[PDB]
C-alpha cells in the first residue's frame, strides 16, 4: 500500500461506503469522477469524498485530500476503481465520486453515520 | 501645535498611514455618485449610508486582472474608463432608464406647477 | 518554597532559583504583580545558569528530544553541573520529569506553583538572558520554528517553484529592454548611414554591421570583400559601398563614434545575460516538473505555472480552467510555443486544445505529489496527443 | 444685493466644453431622481408608522 | 547585508566578490568597504537566518549583479559625455 | 455581475485596524497586501497609486464571517502576537497575516502533514509567519518555539475545542488577553440542538477560568455555526 493513502478502508466499511454510493446513485446525489469531485469541493455542496487506491499513477488524485482539509471534509480509500465503477452505475473505472449536500433527503441519516465512520478511522 | 496638526493628516498606525487626499472637482464628483447609487438600478437595492458626509481618509483604484478570470470577470480595455464617472457615461443599460425617470419626473413637475 | 524551576527556550537551557511566594494568593489581584512586575520578579527569582545553543543543528537536535520527553545530553550536563546532591526541580512536562529522576536522583514536579512562575520567567525571558547569546531570542524562535517544522513534513528545498516564476517576469522585462534599446541604437547610426537602416532587416544582425563598420569614409577594397562574407550576398555589399560613397546622412565625430560603440556593446551583453537565463529556466523545470516540461515544453510549462500562481495551484484547478490560463496568448490554440508532430485542421483546432489542456491538468499533479520527479508519464501523454492528431489529420 | 452688481465689478462665468456639460448635465439628472426617490420612501416609512 | 549595506554598486560588487556565507570568514573587503564595517558584516555571516543556495542558484546571481556594475559604468559615461556636449553647444547655459 | 477586473474604485478604512472597505457598484471587504502583486488563492487583489489591497471571502474564512456579520470586536490589530490553531493551507492565516503588519507575529498550528507544506511555502514569502507543524493538543510539545502572545484564534473543529483553548491559553496567553472561538455546534455534539451547544460550550469557558464577552451566529455564509470572543484573566 502507498503511506499517501493513508485512510483505507477495511472489508466491512467499505461495503457499507459503496451500498450508500448505490442509493445516492438513485436520489440524483452523485458526482462521478475528479474532476467534477473539485467543483463539488469549491461549491461546498459535498457529503464526503470517496477514492479509488489502486489509481496506476496515486498522483492523480492527491490534489483532493488538499481541497477536503481546507473544507474540512472526510474522505477515504477504497481497493479497486472496478468496484467503485458499478458502485456509481458507470461502465467505466472511477477514481473519484462525491456525494452532495441535498436539503430534505432521507438519506441524512445513513451520511452522518457513515461520516462519523470516517472519522474515527482518523482517531 | 505642529504635533496635533502633523498627526491629523494621516489616519495613522492602525491603518498603515493612509493619507488624507487633496479634494478636487473630480474627486468629489465620483464621491458623490457614489453616495447616489442606490437610484441607478430600479432592481437593485442597498443598505443605507454609514456617513452622511465624505470620509476623510481613501484612495483611488483599479482592480487587477486575473488569469483565471478571463472569461468570467474582466472588462475589455476599449470600455475602461479612467473615472466612475465616465463609466457611467458609458453604459447604455443607466442611460436609458435615467432619462425615463428624470422625463417622468420633469412632466409631473409642469403638470403640477400648471 | 525555594524550588529550581528547568525553562527551555529556543535559544538554550535556562536554570532558575526561586527564593520565597506567596502560592495560596498568587492567583488574586493585588498578590498577582509579584510576577507580573518585572521589578518584583527580580526580588524572587534569580538566573544561576544558562547554557546557549552552539548552532542552528545543536538546537533541532534539542527541540526533538524535548517534544519527545527524553532528556538530551547537553540538558543533562546542565543539570549534574549546576545542581546540588532532596531537591525540588519544577518541569513543563510530567514526561521529562519521570526521565530526569530516572537519570538523576532529583524530584520533579509539574503542578503547584510551579505552572505559574513559568509564566512569569516566559514573559519576561529577553530582560533576564540579555546579552548572554549573540543571536536574539526573537530571531531563534522563528529560524528553529522553520526548521522543526521543515524535519516533521520531509521538506525537499530543490522541488521549489520560486525562481521559475521570478524567471519568467524577468525574461519579459529582459525583451522589453532589449528591443527598446536596439531602436535606439538603431536610430543613432540612422543619422550617420540613413540607407543602411532600409537593407538590413533584422536587429541583431544591423549592430553587427555596424560595429564591422565604423564610418562610411572608410568601406572599399579588401573591406568589401569582407562585408561580402558579413552579409548574406555579394551582391547587397557592393550596393552598400556605393550607398556609403554618396549618402544623405551627417558625419560623426570621434567622440560620437566611442560613445555609439559602446552603448552597441552593452546592448549585446544585455541579450547574452537573457539567453543564458532562459537556459537556466530550463534545467530549473526539469528538476522541478519533468512530466509537464516533457509534454508541453519547458517555456510553456513555467508560463503556466506563473499563471497560476504556484505549481501547487495549477494542480488544484479542474482540467476546464486549465485552459482558460492560456486562453489570452493562445498557448494551447497556437501549435508550430509548443511543438508537435503533425498539424490539427481549422474544424478540430478546439477539440485538440481542450485535450491537450487535460493532459496538462494530469503532467502537474504528478510532478507536484511524486516522491521523486520523472519525465516517463510526460512522454507517455506526449505520445497520446500525438496518436489523437494523426487520428483527425488522416482520418484514422 | 446679489441682484445688483457694478459693471466694473461682476466677474465674467466660467467657460466651459461639450465633454464637460455632458458629465455636469448627468450629474444633475441623477441628483434629481435620487431626491425624488428617497423623498418618496419618507411617506412610506411615515404611513406605516 | 541588505539592512546593513545602502550603497547599491557596493552591495553588487560584494555578491561578486564572494558567493556564500562561508567565503565572507576568509575573503577581504578592505578595498570594498570600510574596516569596521567589514566586521559587521563579517560577523553578521556567522548568525544567519537564510537558506543554503544551490551552486546554479549562485551563478544565476552573479551574472544579474554583473549586469548592474556594467549598466552603473557605462550610465556614468553617458553622463561624462553629455558634460562634454552641453559645454560644447551651450557654454554659457551650463555656467548659470 | 460583480467587481470586473478593470473598474475604477474606492478604498477606505474599516472600523476595525487593519481592514479596509472597498467601495464599488459591490462593496468587498480588504486587507493590505504584505507581499504586494501576489494571490494567495485566487482572490481579487486592488492596486492603488506601491499599494495594494487582497479582497477576503467571507465563504472560505469564519473571520471575515464575523465580521461582516457586526461583531464588536476582533482584537487582532497591527503589532501584535497572534497564536493560531488549526491553520489548515492558510488562507486565513495569510489575511491575518496581512492585520497584524511587518511587526505583528503570527503563530500557526497545523498537525497534518499535507497541509503543513502548504504552510511552510506560505511563510517562505511572508516573514512574520512561524510555521509550527505539531498537535494543538499537546502546547508542552512546541513550547520551546512560543512566547506570550496577546490574542488566540481557535478553528480546530474537535469535540474538545474548549478542553484545547484552556490548555493553550494557560500556556502562552497573557494576563489581559484575548481569544477567538469557532463553533461548529455538529461537531461538539450531533444529537444536542445547535442552540443548547452554543450555551454549554460557554458554560465550560467560565469553568476554565475564561470570561466570554459576545458571541454571535455566521448565518448568511454559515449554518448552526457561531464565534465567541472573550478575555483571560481580565486586569482589575
Redesign the interface.
Known amino acids: 500500500v502507498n503511506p499517501k493513502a493513508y485512510p483505507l478502508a477495511d472489508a466491512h466499511l467499505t461495503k457499507k461506503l459503496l451500498d450508500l454510493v448505490q442509493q445516492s446513485c438513485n436520489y440524483k446525489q452523485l458526482r462521478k469522477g475528479a474532476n467534477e469531485a473539485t467543483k463539488t469541493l469549491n461549491r461546498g455542496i459535498s457529503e464526503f469524498i470517496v477514492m479509488a487506491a489502486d489509481a496506476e499513477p496515486l498522483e492523480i488524485i492527491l490534489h483532493l485530500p488538499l481541497l477536503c482539509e481546507d473544507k474540512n471534509v472526510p474522505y477515504v480509500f477504497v481497493r479497486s476503481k472496478q468496484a467503485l465503477g458499478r458502485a456509481c452505475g458507470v461502465s467505466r473505472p472511477v477514481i473519484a465520486c462525491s456525494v452532495t449536500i441535498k436539503e430534505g433527503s432521507q438519506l441524512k441519516q445513513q451520511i452522518q453515520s457513515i461520516q462519523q465512520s470516517i472519522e474515527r478511522l482518523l482517531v | 501645535k505642529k504635533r496635533r496638526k502633523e498627526r491629523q493628516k494621516t489616519?495613522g498606525?492602525?491603518?498603515?498611514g493612509?493619507k488624507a487626499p487633496e479634494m478636487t472637482n473630480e474627486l468629489k464628483?465620483?464621491?458623490?455618485?457614489?453616495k447616489?447609487?442606490?437610484?441607478?438600478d430600479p432592481k437593485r437595492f442597498y443598505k443605507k449610508n454609514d456617513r452622511d458626509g465624505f470620509?476623510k481618509?481613501?484612495?483611488?483604484?483599479?482592480?487587477?486582472?486575473?488569469?483565471?478570470?478571463?472569461?468570467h470577470?474582466?472588462?475589455p480595455?476599449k470600455?475602461?474608463?479612467?473615472?466612475?464617472?465616465?463609466?457611467?457615461?458609458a453604459d447604455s443599460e443607466f442611460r436609458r432608464y435615467?432619462?425615463r425617470?428624470?422625463s417622468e419626473?420633469m412632466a409631473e413637475k409642469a403638470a403640477n406647477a400648471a | 518554597v525555594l524550588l529550581h524551576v528547568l525553562f527551555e527556550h529556543a535559544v538554550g537551557y535556562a536554570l532558575l532559583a526561586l527564593k520565597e511566594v506567596e502560592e495560596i494568593s498568587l492567583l488574586q489581584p493585588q498578590v498577582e504583580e509579584s510576577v507580573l512586575n518585572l521589578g518584583k520578579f527580580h526580588s524572587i527569582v534569580r538566573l544561576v545558569a544558562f547554557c546557549p545553543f552552539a548552532s542552528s543543528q545543536v538546537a533541532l537536535e534539542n527541540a526533538n528530544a524535548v517534544s519527545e520527553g527524553v532528556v538530551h545530553e547537553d540538558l543533562r550536563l546542565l543539570l549534574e553541573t549546576h545542581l546540588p546532591s532532596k531537591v525540588l526541580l519544577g518541569v513543563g512536562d510530567p514526561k521529562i520529569g519521570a526521565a530526569i529522576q530516572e537519570e538523576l536522583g532529583y524530584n520533579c514536579q509539574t503542578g503547584g506553583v510551579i505552572a505559574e512562575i513559568l509564566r512569569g520567567v516566559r514573559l519576561h525571558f529577553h530582560n533576564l538572558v540579555k546579552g548572554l547569546t549573540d543571536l536574539s531570542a526573537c530571531k531563534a524562535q522563528l529560524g528553529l520554528g522553520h526548521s522543526y517544522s521543515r524535519a516533521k513534513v520531509k521538506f525537499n528545498v530543490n522541488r521549489v517553484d520560486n525562481m521559475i516564476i521570478q524567471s519568467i517576469s524577468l525574461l519579459d522585462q529582459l525583451d522589453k529592454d532589449i528591443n527598446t534599446f536596439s531602436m535606439r541604437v538603431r536610430e543613432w547610426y540612422g543619422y550617420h548611414f540613413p540607407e543602411l537602416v532600409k537593407i538590413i532587416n533584422d536587429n541583431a544582425t544591423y549592430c553587427r554591421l555596424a560595429q564591422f563598420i565604423g564610418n562610411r569614409r572608410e568601406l572599399n577594397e579588401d573591406k568589401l570583400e569582407k562585408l561580402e562574407e558579413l552579409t548574406m550576398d555579394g551582391a547587397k555589399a557592393k550596393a552598400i559601398l556605393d550607398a556609403s560613397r554618396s549618402s544623405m546622412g551627417m558625419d560623426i565625430s570621434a567622440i560620437d563614434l566611442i560613445n555609439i560603440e559602446s552603448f552597441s556593446s552593452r546592448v549585446v551583453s544585455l541579450s547574452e545575460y537573457r539567453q543564458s537565463l532562459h537556459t537556466y529556466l530550463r534545467s530549473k523545470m526539469s528538476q522541478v516538473a519533468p512530466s509537464l516540461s516533457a509534454l508541453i515544453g519547458e517555456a510553456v510549462g513555467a508560463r503556466l505555472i506563473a499563471?497560476?500562481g504556484s505549481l501547487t495551484n495549477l494542480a488544484k484547478?479542474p482540467a476546464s480552467?486549465v485552459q482558460?490560463?492560456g486562453?489570452?496568448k493562445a498557448l494551447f490554440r497556437a501549435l508550430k510555443h509548443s511543438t508537435f508532430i503533425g498539424r490539427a485542421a481549422a474544424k478540430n483546432k478546439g477539440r485538440i486544445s481542450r485535450y491537450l489542456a487535460n493532459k496538462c491538468s494530469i503532467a502537474s499533479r504528478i510532478d507536484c505529489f511524486s516522491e521523486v520527479p520523472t519525465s516517463v508519464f510526460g512522454e507517455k501523454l506526449r505520445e497520446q496527443v500525438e496518436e489523437r492528431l494523426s487520428f483527425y489529420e488522416t482520418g484514422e | 444685493k446679489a441682484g445688483k452688481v457694478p459693471k466694473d465689478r461682476r466677474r465674467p462665468a466660467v467657460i466651459r466644453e461639450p465633454h464637460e456639460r455632458?458629465?455636469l448635465a448627468?450629474?444633475d439628472?441623477?441628483?434629481?431622481?435620487?431626491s425624488?426617490?428617497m423623498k418618496k420612501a419618507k411617506e412610506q416609512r411615515h404611513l406605516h408608522n | 547585508l541588505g539592512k546593513i549595506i545602502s550603497d547599491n554598486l557596493t552591495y553588487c560588487k560584494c555578491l561578486q566578490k564572494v558567493g556564500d556565507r562561508k567565503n565572507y570568514a576568509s575573503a577581504k573587503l578592505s578595498e570594498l568597504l570600510p574596516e569596521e564595517v567589514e566586521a559587521e558584516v563579517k560577523a553578521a555571516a556567522e548568525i544567519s537566518m537564510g537558506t543554503e543556495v544551490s551552486e546554479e542558484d549562485i551563478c544565476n546571481i552573479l551574472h544579474l549583479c554583473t549586469q548592474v556594475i556594467e549598466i552603473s559604468e557605462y550610465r556614468t559615461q553617458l553622463y561624462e559625455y553629455l558634460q562634454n556636449r552641453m559645454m560644447a553647444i551651450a557654454p554659457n547655459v551650463t555656467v548659470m | 455581475r460583480?467587481?470586473?477586473?478593470?473598474?475604477?474604485?474606492?478604498?477606505?478604512?474599516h472600523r476595525h485596524?487593519?481592514v479596509?472597505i472597498c467601495?464599488?457598484?459591490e462593496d468587498a471587504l480588504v486587507t493590505?497586501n504584505l507581499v504586494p502583486g501576489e494571490?494567495v488563492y485566487?482572490e481579487?487583489?486592488?492596486?492603488?497609486?506601491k499599494?495594494?489591497?487582497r479582497a477576503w471571502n467571507p465563504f472560505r474564512s469564519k473571520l471575515a464571517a464575523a465580521i461582516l456579520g457586526g461583531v464588536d470586536q476582533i482584537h487582532i490589530?497591527?503589532?501584535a502576537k497572534v497564536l493560531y490553531l488549526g491553520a489548515a493551507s492558510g488562507t486565513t492565516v495569510s489575511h491575518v497575516s496581512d492585520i497584524v503588519?511587518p511587526d505583528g507575529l503570527v503563530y500557526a498550528v497545523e498537525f497534518s502533514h499535507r497541509s503543513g507544506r502548504d504552510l511552510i511555502n506560505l511563510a517562505k514569502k511572508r516573514t512574520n509567519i512561524i510555521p509550527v507543524i505539531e498537535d494543538a493538543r499537546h502546547p508542552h510539545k512546541y513550547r520551546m518555539l512560543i512566547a506570550m502572545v496577546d490574542v488566540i484564534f481557535a478553528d480546530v473543529a474537535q469535540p474538545d475545542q474548549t478542553r484545547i483553548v484552556a490548555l493553550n491559553a494557560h500556556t502562552f496567553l497573557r494576563n489581559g488577553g484575548h481569544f477567538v472561538i469557532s463553533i461548529k455546534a455538529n461537531c461538539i455534539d450531533s444529537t444536542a440542538s445547535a442552540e443548547a451547544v452554543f450555551a454549554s460550550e460557554v458554560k465550560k469557558m467560565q469553568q476554565e477560568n475564561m470570561k466570554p464577552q459576545e458571541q454571535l451566529t455566521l448565518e448568511p455564509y454559515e449554518r448552526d455555526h457561531a464565534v465567541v470572543v472573550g478575555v483571560y484573566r481580565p486586569p482589575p
Open positions: 489616519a498606525d492602525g491603518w498603515f493612509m464628483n465620483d464621491l458623490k455618485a457614489l447616489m447609487r442606490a437610484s441607478m470620509p481618509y481613501f484612495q483611488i483604484g483599479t482592480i487587477v486582472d486575473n488569469p483565471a478570470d478571463f472569461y470577470s474582466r472588462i480595455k470600455q475602461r474608463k479612467r473615472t466612475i464617472v465616465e463609466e457611467l457615461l435615467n432619462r425617470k428624470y419626473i | 499563471h497560476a484547478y480552467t482558460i490560463l486562453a489570452e | 455632458k458629465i448627468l450629474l439628472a441623477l441628483s434629481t431622481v435620487h425624488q426617490k | 460583480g467587481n470586473q477586473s478593470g473598474k475604477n474604485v474606492m478604498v477606505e478604512p485596524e487593519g479596509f467601495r464599488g457598484k493590505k494571490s485566487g481579487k487583489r486592488v492596486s492603488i497609486s499599494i495594494e489591497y490589530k497591527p503589532g503588519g
